[PDB]
Scaffold this active site. Structure first.
Site, PDB file in Angstrom:
ATOM      1  N   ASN D 375      43.478  18.514 -15.678  1.00 19.77           N
ATOM      2  CA  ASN D 375      43.168  17.471 -16.638  1.00 19.77           C
ATOM      3  C   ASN D 375      41.658  17.250 -16.701  1.00 19.77           C
ATOM      4  O   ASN D 375      40.868  18.009 -16.134  1.00 19.77           O
ATOM      5  CB  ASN D 375      43.920  16.188 -16.284  1.00 19.77           C
ATOM      6  CG  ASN D 375      43.426  15.557 -15.001  1.00 19.77           C
ATOM      7  OD1 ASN D 375      43.242  16.236 -13.993  1.00 19.77           O
ATOM      8  ND2 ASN D 375      43.211  14.249 -15.033  1.00 19.77           N
ATOM      9  N   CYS D 377      39.952  14.958 -15.303  1.00 19.61           N
ATOM     10  CA  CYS D 377      39.442  14.613 -13.985  1.00 19.61           C
ATOM     11  C   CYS D 377      39.825  15.634 -12.924  1.00 19.61           C
ATOM     12  O   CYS D 377      39.521  15.425 -11.744  1.00 19.61           O
ATOM     13  CB  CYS D 377      39.932  13.222 -13.576  1.00 19.61           C
ATOM     14  SG  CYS D 377      39.666  11.941 -14.823  1.00 19.61           S
ATOM     15  N   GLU D 379      42.579  16.530 -11.417  1.00 18.54           N
ATOM     16  CA  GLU D 379      43.503  16.151 -10.358  1.00 18.54           C
ATOM     17  C   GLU D 379      44.964  16.282 -10.755  1.00 18.54           C
ATOM     18  O   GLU D 379      45.829  16.246  -9.872  1.00 18.54           O
ATOM     19  CB  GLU D 379      43.227  14.714  -9.883  1.00 18.54           C
ATOM     20  CG  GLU D 379      44.193  13.651 -10.380  1.00 18.54           C
ATOM     21  CD  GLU D 379      43.878  13.180 -11.781  1.00 18.54           C
ATOM     22  OE1 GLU D 379      42.769  13.471 -12.268  1.00 18.54           O
ATOM     23  OE2 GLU D 379      44.734  12.505 -12.388  1.00 18.54           O
TER      24      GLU D 379
END
Ligand code: ATP
Ligand code: ATP
Ligand code: TTP
Ligand code: MG
Ligand code: MG
Ligand code: MN
Ligand code: MN
Ligand code: MN
Ligand code: MN
Lengths: 289, 683, 289, 683
Positions: D375, D377, D379
């Site tokens: 994604n 971020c 994670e």
């Protein structure tokens, strides 16, 4: 009667060394003897020194003392050409043809060469002796400047012209011809300003000014002879160059309104061959037909 | 340098103070003796050629299977019996470099001019050998020229769509904007030029779900569309071309225009997105009276009235918008905006100008919709209905997106053959066939409007060529008289063919009953004004051809009333960029830009004189820039009075004239009834 | 670290007055009110008068006291632009828009004007106070020069840019934009030369030079506010002009390596429309742990 | 300057050589006694407040209608009974500036911290008063923190979506690319960060239906997505953030990376779209052996094998790709590519690094699909199936597009309350509710994946805060032992809650039967290895709590085998950027960037000390840049062994270290089992 036409001529002659590609000289340079390359480097280095001082000192100081915004604009433009265009062009030539060490060495050589130091001492001394509102000190510096423009450069110009005329080093030669074209008009212009001051004097004062001009020319000439021999003996051309500098000394005198001093001689013919859209508002009548 | 190129460059070399125009002919011979015949693939018989082209996925099997091989051979023989010869080197060069079918390695020529014409005719006829031979005689006489998409791609398996002008309506929603981007990409993939109407989109600083100052305006949508058109560039062959149209009363109109300024930043300027401005009569009235105008926020108008700003008549709605406190608006100077338009057109030729009321006062299908915008070439002017593209797993409301079918009559060839009627009717039939055979599965509104409206664009070209070769100045009243008569006959026979097709198929275009054709209003000026030539020279030009009179127009009106009309739109004059070279014709109805044009192909120079240019007609081939733009406007209006759609009208300006002159030309075009202004080309 | 780069940027920006045809401005000039024409004339004369000081004194005096051949050449080029290009350009604009008698009267008025004189003489005073081999006095003059190039001109530039952004007086506005673009680079360059001197000073001397610069800025700024109201109140623009002065004062300070003095403000949109980490190769055994 | 601002700035004014941390507390008091209490809107009772918030379109009335007003009053009283006080000024400031509900004009404060927590709890409970009180106690104790979308938008009428991140698979087609652009704009409109896998798109110079060198590659799609994210920027409030992920074996991988070079041209540079690189173990093996690698053209591989390049294992198919003449490939230096990655991360912090084999060697749902990208971020690591978006009027094959709901455990508050089990189960229930009430009508694959996968993300915050406040160095082995035990407990109770939800609802996630949860493989390391603390200090820290042993894990494995699991994915450790301020917690499991952070708000400056920072724990709050990145990698791997999805692992680098040090850190992370690397932030 003349400044406007000199202004127009100077600005229309504007150029930069980068307009001329120099890599075409690489082979004719490679082919010259070590003696020839040495003389060539040193000759251009001597020219660089003269233009450095003409741009840094000579032209700006004369501009400061000459009255009239248009006269000052011409002199300021000429000053810019000296150091921003002419002096820099020599580095363009050096950087193309020579390795850094040879470039470093030739600039060290200008600092220690006694004839080049003497001529700089004499010319710059006269520039720095100008006194505000003292037209005689100004005249003396203008004579010095004409001698730099129309006489002193020529021991240097000889060699690029000599090669150009044989079809050698023609890109460097093109740069030099542009520089020479500029100096010719610079020498005429400063000559006309010098004549203005000379023409204001008594006959007695004029006689002294001619003495000054001729004594200075002879002193510079004798030094230039030694400089010429020092540079050109190794390439066999000293006598030929001497004839050329005498020829140009006469042109410098003429630029000052004086008679020629040296007798005419045959110059090497090789060197002679070296020479948005406009906007209007809408009227109410444009909406009816 | 090749021999034909030397023979072509020998034109400029003057002998006895005259250009060697005839040398061009020799060049053609060389271009065929040295290059074309050497690199043309030859077969033992046409059967082997057709088998090789079909098997190697060059042609389509479906259109060739409708004929027996004897019929196809007869059509090819009819094409080759003309012994057609290109009169100029550039004609053959343009055909064999742009339109002739080449092998996958692009080193051999599979199609001659006769082969391509025969294939296009067989595709047009759809199984009728006699109709195919009629099409072959039409195209080999060079009376009619299918557009570049149709001419290049007809009968070819590896091809784009035959339509390249697409007009899209964009509704004021993120779903509709994304769908418009997708459809623009899909149509550019097909090779078509896409025009999008952005007037329904709410301006910058409007509310999204009742949060203020949230909308990016139409400029962000233009950036998205410009990126989409850059991405979709015909598989890396041509630069993706798109157009965006905004109403001049949209508030973003300045920012819109600011997208074409040179000083615009990288986040403002769109480079591959053409822009056009729609100018209602209200804006011209406000500028004329010097009253300060108002640019409105479209979403506030939509919230107040339930309809989009561009969906209602601004002439009757402007005062109500201004006096409505719930409608948000910004003060502007209409004369300053006109000067900005003129300055932008001087700098870059943008924006295109659409005079909305000039289009809609003669629009026959105002009941369906008023013409809100034009195409990428600013000559397609049709009714369009916006589509409501909803969320996923929700049924979309499919509207009407314009996609007309291009094809140009060669006025010189048509009139020298005295075949206005036959050429117009055959061109109408071919355009109808191409419109019926067009099926776009990624543009729902384009497909729906193609099925319903059945709109075609029949253009004309070689107007200036014909006039110059007949000793008529383009700006002369005789030229306008000829244009009036010729295009009135073109309109008459186009309407007659449309009504005949409607009678034969038993169907008209959707919502025809509300059109002015059904009510007979369209024929009013035709049943009262006689359009026969007023000059003896033009009448002698039309000798041998029946010129429809007022009685003939009354009979046609009765025929349309009884049987209807198959096409919602029939005539539109496209620029005709490269097909004018192959046809040896001047481009569109525009005057010529140069008498002899110099072009650079590869590292070689080439010279194209205008067709029929000689010492006798050198003066009549006046360049467009030297002409008075008011008289060009007069001629274009004379033609436009007989064209239901618009005409690609490029202004030709000198560098001396200012923005006041450009604005004066635009205002005279608006006064004279000009529907669209295409470009401002400065010499 | 910077002179050759500025040399390049300067010479590639070279232009001449003749390149822009001015006559088409008369088509918008005739439609301005008397107050607009009056303000424009007065602003233009203000710019002309200040730029003449920079050409005759400001640039040549700095070129004289700065050491370095390449710096002297760049400075000479800038002085040339003031005298040969900018001065002729301002004259051309005037001669196009006003008859001879009107030009003479406007210059008489602006020559006597208290706010124009105050700033002109403050700047000239600092140029006249430079002493040979005294880098402190040179720095003070450089600060004055940067304030002229990057700050004082802008109360004047505002108006031509304001018209230029509206589609009025486009030819003279194009000229002004070219002039302004030259003054911007002049200000940045002289600013770097001033920072060089500043950085050679002790901490106490630095604090003292900062106080000098801020004090000078304050004096000039308070006079600019008065100058601004005097010219722009009659055309209703003074509030917006004041924002433009402060924005340009901040640029001038940044040119001298100082922090902005004034809070950030947005500028009139019409005027706006007118305007490595060390790479080290993987040595293997970096993949094993 | 405000009084609380002066009190907060008084922290840095040292007294007796020590920071005045207690002054911070005073600031909060000022911030409440001078700003918050005056700017709050008080009603006569809770009934008037709820009615005003409901009728004024602040709150959704549906979730409040499931409770009688007595129950809502009891929930609010439970929230206010804790007498929660913000211990730092920045916590209250961040809540009341970013998360507290304000009026339409944003002049007054309508929601206190207790009001927001009560509303979120009532939304979570879905009609259960006791469950609402449990959520209130969980959030007012700050044991659990819903993500910024959920915490900010729960129960609000003007809310966006509660899902933070969305992951889209883009198929290699123009229709799929346009649909991906549309879905990205729709999800950015909803406020979520969108990640797109571009590895299936064919590289530059590929064929679009037999015409070669036609594709623009992934860079053109990158530009389209960048413009789409620029346009859809949360109504101009938060800049639209997108992520593009490309496999390192894609031919465009260099051009991809060239989008983030600071010297990139405007036609290539992309500035609002984050970039991530997916590195299989094959690439690391090739770089380690210094053997020249090959990047591949995806379309040739798809033509030859029928599957996408990223759809199969490169570790077993790379040699077949190289030896296959029908597969097109380009030679690259894998070590040079690694050095380019390190240089790019040093310059700009991009790309994200996803070690594909590290993700998929412990991925529990490889049967559904391998994890091919992460994604925004880096994670979220879940199985995704690409969608086949077909032409209009054709049915689309809807795949699985990843989307999970974020929620973070506050480690300090969870362990202080000795409530790992209760907090984990309640957070799992809240995330399940957020998933169930999420319905996105413009992203079909996202909706289908949310309905089928039922994936949630349960993160953790305040790891470094808990360790420093308990006298444990973040780099110490004791800290890693604590992380091992705590996150094994979190995983155990998350699996237990997922199985209990599956039992109570009688349904598991789609295709659970093929997962390692169903086969019992997932529990292998949990039924053979004991994760109880190895240090006495950590065991004392875990006193009062039943640490699961191998027998408890065996019982949980049997329970999962009998009942299944409701959630395909349960744990993902998000960065938790701004909501960590409100909870008085260090961001995520990352070490603190600085002990006291100076942030400029308006014209004022504020200093936020790390939670619990003091003289006795000053050196336990070691700054991340001063830490050994290898020991941080060890910590992240220790946590990752118990997290089914990834962890947003930001690298904290010094300016002195070279790109070789960054490459060494990346290779050690790959060696230690790190799934993803988020950022390379240089001090
Ligand atoms: N101007 C031209 N336009 C088109 N094709 C041409 C042209 N000139 C030559 N060709 C091509 O070259 C062939 C040779 O034509 P040429 O002028 O030599 O005499 P011809 O009597 O037309 O020859 P052929 O026996 O081929 O019919 C033509 O048949 C035609 O295919
Ligand atoms: N740090 C804080 N966090 C949250 N709310 C606070 C904070 N400080 C003050 N307040 C709010 O401002 C009010 C001011 O009261 P204060 O904390 O000074 O004590 P009080 O008047 O004795 O009452 P109490 O502490 O029992 O609320 C508090 O009741 C609370 O609503
Ligand atoms: C239309 C188009 C496609 N592409 C690329 C991006 C897509 O990932 C890829 C696939 O396009 P497709 O939409 O699949 O094109 P196609 O189906 O007609 O061709 P094919 O049968 O070979 O699949 O082509 C471009 O780069 N530029 C373009 O203009
Ligand atoms: Mg809507
Ligand atoms: Mg495809
Ligand atoms: Mn010189
Ligand atoms: Mn000179
Ligand atoms: Mn100047
Ligand atoms: Mn200057």
């Amino acid at each position: 009667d003349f400044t406007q036409m000199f202004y127009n001529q100077n600005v229309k002659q504007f150029w930069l060394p980068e307009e001329i590609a120099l890599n075409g000289d690489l082979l004719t340079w490679k082919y010259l003897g070590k003696n020839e390359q040495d003389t060539y480097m040193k000759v251009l280095a001597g020219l660089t020194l003269l233009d450095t001082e003409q741009g840094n000192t000579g032209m700006p100081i004369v501009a400061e003392h000459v009255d009239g915004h248009q006269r000052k604009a011409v002199l300021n433009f000429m000053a810019m050409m000296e150091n921003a265009v002419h002096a820099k062009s020599y580095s363009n030539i050096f950087m193309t043809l020579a390795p850094t060490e040879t470039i470093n060495e030739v600039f060290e050589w200008v600092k220690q060469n006694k004839y080049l130091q003497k001529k700089a001492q004499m010319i710059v001394g006269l520039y720095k002796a100008i006194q505000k509102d003292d037209e005689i000190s100004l005249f003396k510096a203008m004579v010095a400047s004409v001698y730099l423009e129309s006489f002193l450069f020529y021991s240097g110009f000889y060699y690029p012209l000599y090669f150009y005329g044989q079809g050698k080093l023609m890109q460097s030669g093109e740069i030099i011809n542009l520089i020479l074209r500029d100096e010719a008009i610079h020498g005429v212009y400063v000559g006309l300003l010098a004549q203005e001051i000379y023409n204001k004097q008594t006959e007695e004062k004029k006689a002294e000014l001619r003495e000054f001009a001729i004594d200075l020319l002879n002193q510079l000439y004798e030094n230039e002879l030694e400089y010429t021999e020092d540079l050109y003996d190794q390439v066999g051309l000293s006598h030929d160059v001497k004839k050329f500098i005498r020829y140009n000394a006469n042109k410098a005198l003429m630029n000052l309104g004086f008679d020629p001093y040296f007798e005419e001689e045959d110059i090497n013919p090789i060197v002679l061959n070296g020479l948005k859209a406009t906007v209007e508002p809408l009227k109410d009548d444009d909406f009816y037909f | 340098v090749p021999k034909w190129i030397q023979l072509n460059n020998e034109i400029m070399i003057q002998k006895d103070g005259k250009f060697q125009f005839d040398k061009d002919k020799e060049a053609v011979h060389s271009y065929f003796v040295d290059y074309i015949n050497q690199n043309t693939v030859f077969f033992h018989n046409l059967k082997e050629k057709l088998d090789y082209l079909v098997e190697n996925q060059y042609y389509e099997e479906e259109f060739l299977s409708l004929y027996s091989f004897e019929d196809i051979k007869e059509v090819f023989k009819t094409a080759y019996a003309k012994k057609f010869r290109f009169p100029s080197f550039m004609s053959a060069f343009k055909f064999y470099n742009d339109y002739a079918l080449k092998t996958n390695d692009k080193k051999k020529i599979l199609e001659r001019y006769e082969d391509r014409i025969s294939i296009v005719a067989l595709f047009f006829a759809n199984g009728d050998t006699e109709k195919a031979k009629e099409y072959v005689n039409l195209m080999i006489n060079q009376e009619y020229q299918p557009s570049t998409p149709t001419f290049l791609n007809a009968g070819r398996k590896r091809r784009g769509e035959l339509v390249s002008c697409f007009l899209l309506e964009v509704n004021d929603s993120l779903n509709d904007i994304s769908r418009a981007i997708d459809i623009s990409m899909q149509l550019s993939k097909l090779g078509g030029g896409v025009s999008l109407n952005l007037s329904k989109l709410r301006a910058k600083g409007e509310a999204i779900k009742d949060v203020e100052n949230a909308t990016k305006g139409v400029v962000g949508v233009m950036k998205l569309l410009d990126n989409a058109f850059r991405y979709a560039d015909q598989m890396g062959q041509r630069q993706g071309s798109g157009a965006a149209y905004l109403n001049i009363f949209h508030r973003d109109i300045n920012d819109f225009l600011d997208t074409k300024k040179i000083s615009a930043d990288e986040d403002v300027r769109v480079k591959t997105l053409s822009i056009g401005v729609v100018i209602p009569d209200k804006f011209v009235e406000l500028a004329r009276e010097d009253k300060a105008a108002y640019v409105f926020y479209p979403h506030t108008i939509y919230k107040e009235y339930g309809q989009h700003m561009d969906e209602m008549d601004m002439n009757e709605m402007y005062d109500k918008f201004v006096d409505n406190p719930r409608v948000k608006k910004e003060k502007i100077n209409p004369r300053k905006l006109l000067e900005k338009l003129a300055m932008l057109r001087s700098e870059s030729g943008y924006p295109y100008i659409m005079f909305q009321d000039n289009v809609n006062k003669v629009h026959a299908n105002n009941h369906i919709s008023k013409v809100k915008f034009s195409n990428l070439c600013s000559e397609v002017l049709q009714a369009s209905q916006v589509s409501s593209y909803t969320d996923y797993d929700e049924e979309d409301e499919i509207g009407l997106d314009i996609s007309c079918n291009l094809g140009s009559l060669n006025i010189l060839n048509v009139m020298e053959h005295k075949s206005i009627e036959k050429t117009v009717k055959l061109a109408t039939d071919s355009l109808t066939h191409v419109s019926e055979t067009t099926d776009i599965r990624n543009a729902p509104a384009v497909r729906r409007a193609n099925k319903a409206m059945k709109s075609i664009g029949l253009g004309a070209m070689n107007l200036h060529g014909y006039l110059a070769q007949n000793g008529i100045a383009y700006e002369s009243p005789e030229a306008r008289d000829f244009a009036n008569t010729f295009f009135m006959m073109v309109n008459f026979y186009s309407i007659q063919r449309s009504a005949e097709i409607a009678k034969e198929k038993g169907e008209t275009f959707d919502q025809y009953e509300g059109s002015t054709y059904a009510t007979g209003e369209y024929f009013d000026k035709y049943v009262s004004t006689d359009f026969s030539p007023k000059y003896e020279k033009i009448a002698n030009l039309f000798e041998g051809m029946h010129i429809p009179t007022t009685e003939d127009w009354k009979k046609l009106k009765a025929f349309v009333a009884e049987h209807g009309m198959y096409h919602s739109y029939r005539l539109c004059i496209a620029p005709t960029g490269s097909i004018s070279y192959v046809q040896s014709s001047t481009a569109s109805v525009m005057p010529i830009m140069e008498r002899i044009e110099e072009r650079t192909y590869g590292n070689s120079k080439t010279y194209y004189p205008m067709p029929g240019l000689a010492s006798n007609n050198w003066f009549f081939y006046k360049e467009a820039y030297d002409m008075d733009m008011f008289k060009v406007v007069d001629m274009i209006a004379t033609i436009q009075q007989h064209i239901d759609q618009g005409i690609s009208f490029t202004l030709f300006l000198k560098d001396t004239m200012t923005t006041r002159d450009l604005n004066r030309i635009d205002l005279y075009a608006h006064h004279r009834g000009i529907k669209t202004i295409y470009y401002a080309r400065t010499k």
